[PDB]
Structures are given as structure tokens and as C-alpha cells.
Design an enzyme around this catalytic site. Structure first.
Site, PDB file in Angstrom:
ATOM      1  N   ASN B  45      48.039  -6.373  45.342  1.00  0.00           N
ATOM      2  CA  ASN B  45      49.004  -7.096  44.522  1.00  0.00           C
ATOM      3  C   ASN B  45      49.051  -8.571  44.908  1.00  0.00           C
ATOM      4  O   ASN B  45      49.188  -8.915  46.086  1.00  0.00           O
ATOM      5  CB  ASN B  45      50.381  -6.448  44.685  1.00  0.00           C
ATOM      6  CG  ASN B  45      51.423  -7.058  43.784  1.00  0.00           C
ATOM      7  OD1 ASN B  45      51.814  -8.205  43.968  1.00  0.00           O
ATOM      8  ND2 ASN B  45      51.899  -6.284  42.817  1.00  0.00           N
ATOM      9  N   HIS B  56      48.841  -7.057  39.396  1.00  0.00           N
ATOM     10  CA  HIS B  56      49.185  -5.865  40.150  1.00  0.00           C
ATOM     11  C   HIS B  56      47.967  -5.390  40.942  1.00  0.00           C
ATOM     12  O   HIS B  56      46.840  -5.840  40.726  1.00  0.00           O
ATOM     13  CB  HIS B  56      49.701  -4.769  39.217  1.00  0.00           C
ATOM     14  CG  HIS B  56      51.033  -5.079  38.601  1.00  0.00           C
ATOM     15  ND1 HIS B  56      51.818  -4.118  38.004  1.00  0.00           N
ATOM     16  CD2 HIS B  56      51.714  -6.244  38.491  1.00  0.00           C
ATOM     17  CE1 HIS B  56      52.931  -4.676  37.559  1.00  0.00           C
ATOM     18  NE2 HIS B  56      52.892  -5.965  37.839  1.00  0.00           N
ATOM     19  N   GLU B  58      46.265  -2.625  40.924  1.00  0.00           N
ATOM     20  CA  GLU B  58      45.207  -2.036  40.112  1.00  0.00           C
ATOM     21  C   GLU B  58      44.510  -3.094  39.259  1.00  0.00           C
ATOM     22  O   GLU B  58      43.290  -3.035  39.063  1.00  0.00           O
ATOM     23  CB  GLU B  58      45.784  -0.923  39.235  1.00  0.00           C
ATOM     24  CG  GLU B  58      46.494   0.197  40.009  1.00  0.00           C
ATOM     25  CD  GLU B  58      47.971  -0.088  40.295  1.00  0.00           C
ATOM     26  OE1 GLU B  58      48.344  -1.262  40.535  1.00  0.00           O
ATOM     27  OE2 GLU B  58      48.767   0.878  40.293  1.00  0.00           O
ATOM     28  N   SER B  83      51.923   4.866  42.548  1.00  0.00           N
ATOM     29  CA  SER B  83      51.787   5.376  41.194  1.00  0.00           C
ATOM     30  C   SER B  83      51.827   4.221  40.194  1.00  0.00           C
ATOM     31  O   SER B  83      52.666   3.322  40.317  1.00  0.00           O
ATOM     32  CB  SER B  83      52.895   6.385  40.893  1.00  0.00           C
ATOM     33  OG  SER B  83      52.629   7.085  39.692  1.00  0.00           O
ATOM     34  N   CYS B  85      52.209   1.542  37.131  1.00  0.00           N
ATOM     35  CA  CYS B  85      53.116   1.180  36.056  1.00  0.00           C
ATOM     36  C   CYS B  85      52.421   1.380  34.711  1.00  0.00           C
ATOM     37  O   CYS B  85      51.254   1.773  34.632  1.00  0.00           O
ATOM     38  CB  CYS B  85      53.586  -0.264  36.217  1.00  0.00           C
ATOM     39  SG  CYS B  85      52.345  -1.490  35.753  1.00  0.00           S
ATOM     40  N   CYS B  88      49.179  -0.927  34.421  1.00  0.00           N
ATOM     41  CA  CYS B  88      48.028  -0.429  35.166  1.00  0.00           C
ATOM     42  C   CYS B  88      47.548   0.903  34.609  1.00  0.00           C
ATOM     43  O   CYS B  88      46.346   1.186  34.636  1.00  0.00           O
ATOM     44  CB  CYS B  88      48.380  -0.308  36.648  1.00  0.00           C
ATOM     45  SG  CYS B  88      48.860  -1.890  37.391  1.00  0.00           S
ATOM     46  N   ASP B 149      61.135  -7.359  40.427  1.00  0.00           N
ATOM     47  CA  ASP B 149      59.800  -7.023  39.940  1.00  0.00           C
ATOM     48  C   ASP B 149      59.865  -5.653  39.261  1.00  0.00           C
ATOM     49  O   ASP B 149      60.696  -5.482  38.366  1.00  0.00           O
ATOM     50  CB  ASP B 149      58.807  -7.125  41.094  1.00  0.00           C
ATOM     51  CG  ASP B 149      57.365  -6.941  40.644  1.00  0.00           C
ATOM     52  OD1 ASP B 149      57.104  -7.023  39.423  1.00  0.00           O
ATOM     53  OD2 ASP B 149      56.495  -6.710  41.513  1.00  0.00           O
TER      54      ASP B 149
HETATM   55 MN   LIG Z   1      51.110  -2.111  37.587  1.00  0.00          MN
END
Ligand SMILES: [Mn+2]
Ligand SMILES: [Mn+2]
Lengths: 152, 151
Positions: B45, B56, B58, B83, B85, B88, B149
Site C-alpha cells: 500500500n 492499494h 493489490e 481481504s 476491497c 482490488c 481510509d
Molecule cells: Mn483495495
């Protein structure tokens, strides 16, 4: 009227698409507008070829150029994009809680994200903008390898 | 199928720990070729390192992979310490990455985890204690950054 700024939003998005086209990139542009006063929070275009970027789609570049905003700000905005969003740009709209997405055209490209946005409580407006359809049709015709090696 | 999952999550955690040392959110990832276990890319990130609204863990991972051929993505696993969002999740779907291995979904989880399975992707949550610990510490020590965030 929710659509008060939609001509301004799509005009900026198309200008970003045309600018990206002149830079040699994919002609997809966007901008984020505050629904309250019509001010532009950010604008951008696809940077796949300008920056060799796998993730800087037009909507992603637009949101990146907005900077980190307060969560309350996103909740009263409209994201304008010249082309119907892919699944990633759809997810970005959902993740930020942007309530409105106004789409230039979904003739040259369409994903399941357009319908998924409505499932998740967002408003989606397709304006069928002839300028957007024309500039992407030209890109697909002139650069089919770049297009079909990408989201095409 | 899970042959490279310890390697993938170990790289993802090292990216998360590296992001922690840089002062960012400790979320890391990597993309691995399922065929031979080679690493196509890795990242973490960059919200605080670059003032970025979209990088992010990912997303930064896929950006660091560069522009790959579509056939390459179709036989990879994306490893992430947290996990994903909805954004992503959408990136995984848009690239057609068939497998996503998740460190933990205790500190964060979105509707995307289930949506990935709805769209035909395999999601594996390994419940990695290192990932849970480092994100629990971030949420405790930096609640303003977290809740301004995706928290
Ligand atoms: Mn994300
Ligand atoms: Mn996109």
C-alpha cells in the site's frame, strides 16, 4: 436536478480523452465533480501507454489526480467517464461511495460493472455521446492490437 | 494448487512489513505464476508513501508487474495480506486472475470476497497470524489514518 453538471462533466471527460489521444494513448477520459457547486475535484485519462501502466485506467487516473479526499466529499460527487467502466473502475466507484456515474458510451466497451453499480445502489447514466463513440471507434480501428491486448 | 501459497504469502507479508517500516499501511501482495512459482510482481500500500488514493496493496502489486499478456494473468495467484476491497476485487476480476489467497479477513472484509466467488474465482483465506498482528497494531496505533481510509 441531479444532471445539472452532466454536460460540463462529460465535456471535461472528453477533453481528457482527446488529450490522451494526442499523447498517443487510449482515448478514455474522466473527471470527478462536486454535485453541490459543479467544481472539478480532478480529471485524468488512460495512462497505459504514456506511463506503461497496467492500472491507470481513465477512472483510476482521475481518482488518483483528485488526491486523498475526505470520505464525506466522495459521497456527493459524480464520476464522469467517456467509456463504460471495467470491473476495476466499477469497484473503485463502489469503494469510494461515489453515488453517480455518468458514462459517455457503452457501445465500444461494456462490462458487468455497469449493472453491478446499480445492484450496489449507484445511479448510472449513459449519455450515448457521439464524440466519445467516434474517438474510441477510431482507436479500435487504427490500433486493434493495442486494444485487444488490453481490455478489448 | 496450493503449492506456492506459503511462498506467496511470505512475500506478501514481507511487503506489508516493509510498508510498515516506511510509515504506510501494512498491506502487501504479490502475483505468482502458478506453473513454476516465479514472482511476476510484488508491492504494498502506497497511500502514505505517495499520497495515493488508488495504490492499494493489490493495485501496487499489479502496477509493479508491468503490462503483461492477458494469457499470463489467467494462470496466476494474487496473494494479499488483507481481504480485498471492492476496487482490488474488481482488478482481480478485470485481469481474470483465477486465484486469490488472502492473509486474513478479521481486520477488514468487503462484499468483494464473496463477489469474487460469485464471478467464478477461487478465494482462500489462510488466517495468517503475522498479518492479523501487524494490521491490528496499525489500527490501534493509527486509528485516524485507518478510519479516514477503508476502515
Ligand atoms: Mn483495495
Ligand atoms: Mn477500468
Amino acid at each position: 436536478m441531479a444532471s445539472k453538471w452532466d454536460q460540463k462533466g462529460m465535456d471535461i471527460a472528453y477533453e481528457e480523452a482527446a488529450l490522451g489521444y494526442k499523447e498517443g494513448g487510449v482515448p478514455i477520459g474522466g473527471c470527478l465533480i462536486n454535485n453541490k457547486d459543479g467544481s472539478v475535484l480532478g480529471r485524468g485519462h488512460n495512462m497505459r501507454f504514456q506511463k506503461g501502466s497496467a492500472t491507470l485506467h481513465g477512472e483510476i487516473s482521475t481518482l488518483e489526480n483528485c488526491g486523498r479526499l475526505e470520505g464525506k466529499v466522495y459521497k456527493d460527487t459524480t464520476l464522469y467517464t467517456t467509456l463504460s467502466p471495467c470491473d476495476m473502475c466499477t469497484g473503485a466507484i463502489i469503494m469510494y461511495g461515489i453515488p453517480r456515474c455518468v458514462v459517455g458510451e457503452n457501445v465500444n466497451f461494456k462490462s458487468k460493472g455497469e449493472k453491478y453499480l446499480q445492484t450496489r445502489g449507484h445511479e448510472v447514466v449513459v449519455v450515448d455521446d457521439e464524440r466519445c463513440k467516434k474517438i474510441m471507434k477510431q482507436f479500435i480501428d487504427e490500433r486493434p492490437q493495442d486494444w485487444f491486448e488490453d481490455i478489448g
